[PDB]
Amino acid sequence: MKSVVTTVIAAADAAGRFPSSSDLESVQGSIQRSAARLEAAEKLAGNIDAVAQEAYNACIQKYPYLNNSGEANSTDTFKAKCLRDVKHYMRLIQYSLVVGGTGPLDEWGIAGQREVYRALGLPTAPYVEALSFARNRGCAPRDMSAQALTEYNALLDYAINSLS
Amino acid sequence: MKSVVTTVIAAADAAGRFPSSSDLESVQGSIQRSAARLEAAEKLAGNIDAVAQEAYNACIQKYPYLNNSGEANSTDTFKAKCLRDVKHYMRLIQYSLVVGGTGPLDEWGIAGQREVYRALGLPTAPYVEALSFARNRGCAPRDMSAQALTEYNALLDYAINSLS
Amino acid sequence: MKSVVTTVIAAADAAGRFPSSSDLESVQGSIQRSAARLEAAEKLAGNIDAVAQEAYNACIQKYPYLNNSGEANSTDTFKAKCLRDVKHYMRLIQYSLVVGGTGPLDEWGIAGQREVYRALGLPTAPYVEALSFARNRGCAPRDMSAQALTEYNALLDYAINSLS
Amino acid sequence: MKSVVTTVIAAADAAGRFPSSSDLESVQGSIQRSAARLEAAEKLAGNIDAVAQEAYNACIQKYPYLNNSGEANSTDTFKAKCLRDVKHYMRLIQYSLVVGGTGPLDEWGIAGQREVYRALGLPTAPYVEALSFARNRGCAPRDMSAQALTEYNALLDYAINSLS
Amino acid sequence: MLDAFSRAVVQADASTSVVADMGALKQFIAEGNRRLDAVNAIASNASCMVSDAVAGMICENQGLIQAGGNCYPNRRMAACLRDAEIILRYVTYALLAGDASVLDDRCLNGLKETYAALGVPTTSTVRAVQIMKAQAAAHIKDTPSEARAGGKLRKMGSPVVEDRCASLVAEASSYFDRVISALS
Amino acid sequence: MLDAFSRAVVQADASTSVVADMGALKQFIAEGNRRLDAVNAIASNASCMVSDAVAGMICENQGLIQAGGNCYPNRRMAACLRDAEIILRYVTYALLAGDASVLDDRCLNGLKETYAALGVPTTSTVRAVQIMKAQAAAHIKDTPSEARAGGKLRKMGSPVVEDRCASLVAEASSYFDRVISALS
Amino acid sequence: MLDAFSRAVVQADASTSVVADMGALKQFIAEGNRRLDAVNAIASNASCMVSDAVAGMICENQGLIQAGGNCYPNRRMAACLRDAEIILRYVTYALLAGDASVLDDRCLNGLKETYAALGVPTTSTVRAVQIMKAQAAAHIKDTPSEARAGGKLRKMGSPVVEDRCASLVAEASSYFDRVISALS
Amino acid sequence: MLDAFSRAVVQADASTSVVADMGALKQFIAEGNRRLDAVNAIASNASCMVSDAVAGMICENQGLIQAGGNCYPNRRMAACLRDAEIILRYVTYALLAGDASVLDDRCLNGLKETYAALGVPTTSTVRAVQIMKAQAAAHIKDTPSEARAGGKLRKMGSPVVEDRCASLVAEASSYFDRVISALS
Numbered sequence A, B, C, D: 001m002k003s004v005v006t007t008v009i010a011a012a013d014a015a016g017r018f019p020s021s022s023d024l025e026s027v028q029g030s031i032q033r034s035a036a037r038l039e040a041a042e043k044l045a046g047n048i049d050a051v052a053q054e055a056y057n058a059c060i061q062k063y064p065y066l067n068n069s070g071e072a073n074s075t076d077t078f079k080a081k082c083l084r085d086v087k088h089y090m091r092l093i094q095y096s097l098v099v100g101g102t103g104p105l106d107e108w109g110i111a112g113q114r115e116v117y118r119a120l121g122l123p124t125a126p127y128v129e130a131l132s133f134a135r136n137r138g139c140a141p142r143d144m145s146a147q148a149l150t151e152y153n154a155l156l157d158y159a160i161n162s163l164s
Numbered sequence E, F, G, H: 001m002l003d004a005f006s007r008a009v010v011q012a013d014a015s016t017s018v019v020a021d022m023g024a025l026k027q028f029i030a031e032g033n034r035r036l037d038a039v040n041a042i043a044s045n046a047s048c049m050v051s052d053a054v055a056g057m058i059c060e061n062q063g064l065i066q067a068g069g070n071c072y073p074n075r076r077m078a079a080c081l082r083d084a085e086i087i088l089r090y091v092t093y094a095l096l097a098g099d100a101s102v103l104d105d106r107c108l109n110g111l112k113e114t115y116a117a118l119g120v121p122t123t124s125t126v127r128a129v130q131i132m133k134a135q136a137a138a139h140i141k142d143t144p145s146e147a148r149a150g151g152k153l154r155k156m157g158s159p160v161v162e163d164r165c166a167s168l169v170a171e172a173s174s175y176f177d178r179v180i181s182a183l184s
């Protein structure tokens, strides 16, 4: 699972090296940056249902056709699963903020996603709109410090780009 | 050449990835740590001849037999070259402090060194001794800050270990 | 283990061949040359202690600094192990004389040797000097025939070269 | 071209080795054995037409059907090339005696022979019969020394085996 | 590959000298956080940039999507989008390292040859790259126009300074220019 | 592999929950500099450690260097010195990550079985590991003795606290113990 | 692989002793020319041996060449022929070396398991090796019968002695026995 | 590769005729023991020859160990020592074989263009080879000076004749000259 430290460790192992100067430096960056992304991680943990709800709302508002007969938001099951999905991505982003690398989102969110949505005729635009709404939504210092919002937003764009 | 940023870029490229979270964080480490190693690097640059002179002096003192006829410190040419060699290592170390990775020392100092000394019958222990003297020599705050000294000593230990 | 016959069998096997003309011929060479190397082998077998003792003696006389505190010939244990080591090389030469190939020397002496001496901080010059002494010591017909001595010397140079 | 010396050289080169004890011993094998095989090569050089002629004769007298219309010895051109073929093998055998390895016969005679003879519908039994006659024909010391004849026979049997 | 600092060391090694002037390097450190925002701004909007740039290349030259055009059929179009993203990705490596060597060595080397062999048109590629050049500047300065972005407009929200990281803009643009140069 | 953080992430995902216990992690952070020192302390002394330990293993059991001994002849001695270094290397990886997975996965998995096939003595390997465990503890606490080191003594010069990083020493030791538990 | 001499060396090294008794070694040398003749005798008639031995295995067991038999159809017959030759080849290597290790390490190691997975009948394999063993012995003594050979009879013309290389016949036979032994 | 004998065979096969002249091959055999001494003389002193030749190449051209020099830094010095040894090794192969083809095919072919692509200096390469040519001649004649060897002097102890193997010395030199011709 990719983080600052697993990345320098994997590269060191590939060359049969002990951790050296640049490996310790790298991890000090993870030390430096942890406050910002853990603040984001804690804020997101405390408020994930609300954040996910309003992103979900926004994507259905953008695309009301999803509510039409036989479309992907048309039943109670489907509505519940769509919100769950939005939540999944946000929880995986909470994980990535904790880890300090895209690892959790890479492995449990992005990998396989396009296959899954293809197989089930799930349009990807509503996913992108849910995440884009959440990306444009936060502001500092109301929601979190500016550097914490930077981390939050960076992982949202990373998720967005993975679908784009 | 191995540095913080070249290591994460190479890992990124290998997986076809844009720079992401953990990559930027790593470089923030390089940012936080530069003052230390650049302080050491600056001090080393200004005093490299005196620093290498006394390391060289210390290794010859450990092994006076080097002075006997036909030994590796026995002539004016050999003497000048032995001092030069110590200074080469110290300069590669200054380079490696500037870079914040062992790159310059790996590629321009360590790579091939054992072949060369073996082929010319140059005993390795005087090299290790010069560097060990240098490693034990510094004290903070007298010589530089405690973190600068830490950076300085790690590169010396790194080079020592390459001959050990 | 490299000898005349295992070399040609390995070559034949790699090309899926029965032994042929050039293989029998090679082995005829082993037969012809055996008298000389077996002569040296027997001479060495009967007198290896004395042969190794004086070679060992010559390397310490060459490098008395080895007797200094902390150095590789400084204690009784260290001293026994260095003489032992000189006898190891000579016994592997004895083996190589019997086999008619550098096999025994290669696998049980040279392989890994530089790594061991580097890790233990054992200087290689004294090994080279004991073997060079041995190499320069013999003369024919006094110690054995000229052809026996040529075999004996060639394997000493082989061991010396492996350390240079 | 496979001989005693190229075989040991190729093995040394694959291991990045200077010539060593077993390589020189091998070439001594060539020195020792060359008298016998050069004696055979010289006898063959001087008498190859007569030796080929009778081997050729014997295979046709063994298989008269080859003289039938459409068959491989039925025309003057066919007759001339069949004799020529037998002389080819004998010449390559003469080359292999000189070289002291099967090289010449391997590369210039055996490689591809089955594909050729298959393509042109040439039966291999008459080839084998000509060579078998030649192999049973010699006797020592009438034709050459016993060891010269051993060398001669070994290459004939080598050819025979390659067609069997 | 090299970065900003090991590039300085390579220059010092040419005369076997120690690195004495760290002024340019201290500065690189001083603008460290800017560099990261600049990289973040490009990587975060990479997908929008690539599709917008390739689409722009095509809307200005319809021949690319007509019979015998190099963005016809679907797999040529896909290949092109891929190449535009590859190019941007290596530019982002160079901006992250402060040095063009990763770009020169792993991307541009033999690129002109490859394109020549495949009949990929130099002129159209250059224009795609030119658009990406324009985009990255705006994103580095954090002044993208709603006119070009519509609903896809992104603001990065970095601390604003008067020149809006002009020297980083120039450097990023020099990397794009290298690309174009390798094709010319 | 996992690190201390992705480990907590994995444990949370097992109930598809967000990570809420952010105390141990905050703690991990607050001692981040000590961890780096701890790693630096081992790596910088790795060669002295490895050779001292294997030599220590031998001086306690001369069987290893006699006829039929598993450190005889040279190439076996070299092989053992090599292995010692490998294990120390992975342990230091585990310490830097603050998680044992890299060690379990890339080093220990199938190690006992390998040694069984080769006839590499379990007792002796474990001893060498025990000696390095004691070495690592001393260097992390920055209290190595001149008695064990001689002229090769090294002082790290880290900011001293009273418990001399007792927690990290425990962690480091728990990784060497995973080695020992694996080999026996 | 080992040969007769390095086998002795391996045995001396087990007690880190010089090789003192060169009696068997001196005898090996004295019978060196014999050994070369015995290897020449087998290599020179290998094809006739292989074919006669496989055909004799078959004529004594017609089941091998009926439906369900392991020498049916053509490609199985070919594969068997090849195995007989491969076996004979490794036996000649051993005989030339004066040691079975090359035979052991490169041919017999895992042969049993390989045959068991493919369903190669051990009983029949054994018969083919037996015939080669009898053939080899007769060719080493240079006493093949016209009865078993017909128009394909060969004489080596080596210098005859009383026992007709009895010791080398027993050695050669012991390599064939090892083949058969490796099968269980 | 070819040897002195297969060289004759190739020449003969170019007119599909038997090798008829053997007297010259007989003379090769006659000096066979000599040739083995000549080879032993170079091989046994190879390390001393390479280090001494590369050192002399350097002491005559200091540019090589100064900034920008092709024996600077360490890895370049190590490469050069490696190349001198590789060249010496193929030269001894050629002398063992009595034919240049192994030197031509495996070492010299493509080498000039390899060095031009690296900027390995011709003048210094030639000089290194020149010194090894002078060394080789003296060791084959078994007359090396104390002046050039100091305490490293080695004497071979081979049976002395008046001309001290003049044709082998000439032949050895011709192979070194082949190297010099190839590279300049």
Ligand SMILES: *C(=C)C1=C(C)[C@@H](Cc2[nH]c(/C=C3N=C(/C=C4\NC(=O)[C@H](C)[C@H]4[C@@H](*)C)C(C)=C\3CCC(=O)O)c(CCC(=O)O)c2C)NC1=O
Residues within 6 Å of the ligand: E045, E048, E049, E052, E053, E055, E056, E057, E059, E060, E130, E131, E134, E135, E136, E138, E139, E143, E144, E145, E146, E147, E148, E149, E150, E152, E153, E154
């Ligand atoms: C075809 C009819 C056609 C186009 C498609 C379009 C192509 C084009 N785009 C630009 C300039 C920019 N595009 C930008 C892209 C984005 N901005 C965002 O906020 C999102 C993340 C992203 C995707 C929409 C940006 C930032 C720019 C910079 C200019 C600006 O911000 O206004 C150009 C101009 C290129 C140049 O300046 O040379 C072109 C041609 N235009 C078309 O005609």
Ligand SMILES: *C(=C)C1=C(C)[C@@H](Cc2[nH]c(/C=C3N=C(/C=C4\NC(=O)[C@H](C)[C@H]4[C@@H](*)C)C(C)=C\3CCC(=O)O)c(CCC(=O)O)c2C)NC1=O
Residues within 6 Å of the ligand: F045, F048, F049, F052, F053, F055, F056, F057, F059, F060, F130, F131, F134, F135, F136, F138, F139, F143, F144, F145, F146, F147, F148, F149, F150, F152, F153, F154
């Ligand atoms: C055989 C005669 C024999 C040994 C060899 C030796 C092995 C040994 N070593 C230790 C303990 C340590 N070794 C250390 C190593 C070093 N210290 C340094 O400063 C340098 C960098 C490095 C190389 C010499 C260290 C730090 C220790 C910790 C203890 C201390 O510092 O005093 C032990 C003890 C292991 C244990 O606890 O069981 C042994 C056995 N001893 C021999 O008898």
Ligand SMILES: *C(=C)C1=C(C)[C@@H](Cc2[nH]c(/C=C3N=C(/C=C4\NC(=O)[C@H](C)[C@H]4[C@@H](*)C)C(C)=C\3CCC(=O)O)c(CCC(=O)O)c2C)NC1=O
Residues within 6 Å of the ligand: G045, G048, G049, G052, G053, G055, G056, G057, G058, G059, G060, G130, G131, G134, G135, G136, G138, G139, G143, G144, G145, G146, G147, G148, G149, G150, G152, G153, G154
């Ligand atoms: C099936 C009908 C059937 C057979 C086929 C045949 C198989 C067989 N062969 C032998 C013994 C030998 N075969 C030899 C082979 C050769 N001798 C030669 O001169 C040429 C070069 C070569 C090929 C023909 C040799 C040398 C022997 C040894 C005996 C001898 O020489 O007289 C056996 C006997 C094996 C044994 O004793 O166990 C068998 C079964 N026999 C068949 O029944």
Ligand SMILES: *C(=C)C1=C(C)[C@@H](Cc2[nH]c(/C=C3N=C(/C=C4\NC(=O)[C@H](C)[C@H]4[C@@H](*)C)C(C)=C\3CCC(=O)O)c(CCC(=O)O)c2C)NC1=O
Residues within 6 Å of the ligand: H045, H048, H049, H052, H053, H055, H056, H057, H059, H060, H130, H131, H134, H135, H136, H138, H139, H143, H144, H145, H146, H147, H148, H149, H150, H152, H153, H154
């Ligand atoms: C730099 C100051 C410098 C040198 C280094 C040195 C290089 C050099 N060496 C020779 C000649 C020989 N060197 C030989 C080597 C050896 N002799 C031995 O006994 C041992 C085994 C081995 C290593 C020391 C030999 C045999 C010779 C031949 C001459 C001789 O008298 O023995 C030369 C001369 C080469 C030539 O003629 O072109 C040089 C330049 N000389 C330096 O100036």
Ligand SMILES: *[C@@H](C)[C@H]1/C(=C/C2=NC(=C\c3[nH]c(C[C@H]4NC(=O)C(C=C)=C4C)c(C)c3CCC(=O)O)/C(CCC(=O)O)=C2C)NC(=O)[C@@H]1C
Residues within 6 Å of the ligand: A033, A147, A150, B024, B025, B028, E030, E031, E032, E033, E034, E035, E036, E037, E038, E040, E140, E141, E142, E158, E159, E160, E161, E162, E163, E164, E165, E168
């Ligand atoms: C040009 C690129 C921009 C711009 C950039 C500035 N950023 C400044 C400060 C700053 N940026 C960050 C985020 C960055 N640092 C990191 O460690 C990581 C990821 C791990 C990122 C993305 C930080 C932490 C800081 C420092 C704190 C702060 O200043 O708030 C900055 C001010 C410093 C300077 O002048 O160099 C600038 C100018 N600003 C612009 O005007 C354009 C749009």
Ligand SMILES: *[C@@H](C)[C@H]1/C(=C/C2=NC(=C\c3[nH]c(C[C@H]4NC(=O)C(C=C)=C4C)c(C)c3CCC(=O)O)/C(CCC(=O)O)=C2C)NC(=O)[C@@H]1C
Residues within 6 Å of the ligand: C024, C025, C028, D033, D147, D150, G030, G031, G032, G033, G034, G035, G036, G037, G038, G040, G140, G141, G142, G158, G159, G160, G161, G162, G163, G164, G165, G168
């Ligand atoms: C059992 C194998 C045989 C047998 C063998 C004998 N061979 C004897 C001598 C001999 N053989 C060769 C040929 C061999 N040496 C080689 O170098 C090569 C190829 C490179 C081969 C094939 C030679 C050269 C010699 C020596 C001839 C000479 O005297 O110059 C031999 C007599 C010596 C002894 O008693 O050992 C024997 C007995 N003889 C047999 O009875 C069976 C059939």
Ligand SMILES: *[C@@H](C)[C@H]1/C(=C/C2=NC(=C\c3[nH]c(C[C@H]4NC(=O)C(C=C)=C4C)c(C)c3CCC(=O)O)/C(CCC(=O)O)=C2C)NC(=O)[C@@H]1C
Residues within 6 Å of the ligand: C033, C147, C150, D024, D025, D026, D028, H030, H031, H032, H033, H034, H035, H036, H037, H038, H040, H140, H141, H142, H158, H159, H160, H161, H162, H163, H164, H165, H168
């Ligand atoms: C020029 C190279 C030398 C020189 C050489 C001579 N060597 C002569 C004889 C000789 N050398 C060997 C050893 C050689 N044969 C082997 O089988 C092996 C290794 C397996 C080696 C190294 C032997 C066995 C012999 C023959 C016995 C003897 O002569 O003592 C020799 C005399 C024969 C001849 O004239 O060709 C010469 C001249 N002599 C010189 O003057 C320079 C220094």
Ligand SMILES: *[C@H](C)[C@H]1/C(=C/C2=NC(=C\c3[nH]c(C[C@H]4NC(=O)C(C=C)=C4C)c(C)c3CCC(=O)O)/C(CCC(=O)O)=C2C)NC(=O)[C@@H]1C
Residues within 6 Å of the ligand: A040, A043, A044, A045, A047, A050, A051, A054, A137, A138, A139, A140, A142, A143
């Ligand atoms: C800055 C002044 C912005 C702006 C911000 C507003 N946000 C408002 C409500 C709101 N925002 C969020 C998302 C936020 N909560 C989180 O936990 C996280 C990340 C973990 C984020 C980004 C939520 C869930 C809510 C509803 C509950 C709440 O009031 O916080 C808000 C109130 C009015 C509204 O709902 O829109 C404001 C003003 N608005 C602006 O105009 C600038 C651009």
Ligand SMILES: *[C@H](C)[C@H]1/C(=C/C2=NC(=C\c3[nH]c(C[C@H]4NC(=O)C(C=C)=C4C)c(C)c3CCC(=O)O)/C(CCC(=O)O)=C2C)NC(=O)[C@@H]1C
Residues within 6 Å of the ligand: B040, B043, B044, B045, B047, B048, B050, B051, B054, B137, B138, B139, B140, B142, B143
């Ligand atoms: C701390 C109180 C130590 C201690 C320190 C002393 N160092 C002395 C002289 C000295 N040290 C160095 C190395 C230093 N200069 C550099 O440029 C760098 C790295 C770039 C380092 C580590 C040098 C070159 C010199 C001589 C010139 C000078 O004094 O500045 C020193 C003076 C007495 C002496 O030379 O030994 C002291 C006391 N000494 C201690 O006992 C504690 C452990």
Ligand SMILES: *[C@H](C)[C@H]1/C(=C/C2=NC(=C\c3[nH]c(C[C@H]4NC(=O)C(C=C)=C4C)c(C)c3CCC(=O)O)/C(CCC(=O)O)=C2C)NC(=O)[C@@H]1C
Residues within 6 Å of the ligand: C040, C043, C044, C045, C047, C048, C050, C051, C054, C137, C138, C139, C140, C142, C143
């Ligand atoms: C030739 C005349 C030389 C020369 C030879 C001397 N050697 C002397 C003693 C000596 N040499 C050895 C090594 C030798 N013995 C072996 O068993 C083997 C190899 C298996 C070798 C090479 C030993 C062990 C000894 C001491 C016991 C002994 O005397 O045999 C010697 C006596 C004086 C001395 O010890 O130096 C001589 C004269 N000396 C020369 O000046 C020419 C060049």
Ligand SMILES: *[C@H](C)[C@H]1/C(=C/C2=NC(=C\c3[nH]c(C[C@H]4NC(=O)C(C=C)=C4C)c(C)c3CCC(=O)O)/C(CCC(=O)O)=C2C)NC(=O)[C@@H]1C
Residues within 6 Å of the ligand: D040, D043, D044, D045, D047, D048, D050, D051, D054, D137, D138, D139, D140, D142, D143
């Ligand atoms: C030994 C007494 C044999 C035997 C031999 C006979 N060979 C006869 C003629 C003959 N043989 C050859 C082949 C021979 N010449 C060569 O140049 C070479 C190799 C280079 C070999 C093997 C030829 C070409 C000829 C015809 C010319 C000639 O006479 O030399 C021969 C004369 C009668 C006959 O031709 O059959 C004899 C007696 N015959 C035997 O019965 C024993 C076993």
Ligand SMILES: *[C@H](C)[C@H]1/C(=C/C2=NC(=C\c3[nH]c(C[C@H]4NC(=O)C(C=C)=C4C)c(C)c3CCC(=O)O)/C(CCC(=O)O)=C2C)NC(=O)[C@@H]1C
Residues within 6 Å of the ligand: F054, F064, F069, F070, F071, F075, F076, F077, F079, F080, F081, F083, F084, F086, F087, F106, F107, F111, F114, F118, F120, F121, F124, F125, F128
């Ligand atoms: C040293 C304290 C031991 C000892 C060790 C030996 N190990 C030998 C071979 C060997 N070791 C390993 C494990 C190593 N390789 C890895 O890749 C990793 C982790 C990623 C580890 C720990 C392997 C796979 C092998 C076999 C291949 C090889 O040779 O490297 C060895 C040689 C055994 C032999 O061939 O005889 C030794 C001597 N031996 C000791 O006596 C102490 C207790």
Ligand SMILES: *[C@H](C)[C@H]1/C(=C/C2=NC(=C\c3[nH]c(C[C@H]4NC(=O)C(C=C)=C4C)c(C)c3CCC(=O)O)/C(CCC(=O)O)=C2C)NC(=O)[C@@H]1C
Residues within 6 Å of the ligand: G054, G064, G069, G070, G071, G075, G076, G077, G079, G080, G081, G083, G084, G086, G087, G106, G107, G111, G114, G118, G120, G121, G122, G124, G125, G128
């Ligand atoms: C003939 C006397 C047997 C017999 C033999 C068959 N063997 C078949 C396959 C086979 N055999 C081997 C072992 C062989 N390959 C080697 O590399 C070596 C030693 C280096 C040896 C001894 C292998 C590996 C294989 C499988 C690959 C292959 O097909 O060649 C075989 C074919 C079985 C099948 O595919 O059905 C046969 C028939 N069969 C007999 O009936 C007699 C007893």
Ligand SMILES: *[C@H](C)[C@H]1/C(=C/C2=NC(=C\c3[nH]c(C[C@H]4NC(=O)C(C=C)=C4C)c(C)c3CCC(=O)O)/C(CCC(=O)O)=C2C)NC(=O)[C@@H]1C
Residues within 6 Å of the ligand: H054, H064, H070, H071, H075, H076, H077, H079, H080, H081, H083, H084, H086, H087, H106, H107, H111, H114, H118, H120, H121, H124, H125, H128
């Ligand atoms: C020493 C006398 C020279 C010198 C030599 C250097 N050679 C360098 C690299 C190099 N050399 C070769 C040829 C070598 N490899 C082979 O396989 C064979 C024959 C089989 C030979 C002769 C190659 C292919 C290469 C490049 C690849 C590699 O390094 O393996 C070299 C390093 C060049 C660089 O990286 O800049 C040096 C310094 N240099 C000198 O100054 C003297 C004249």
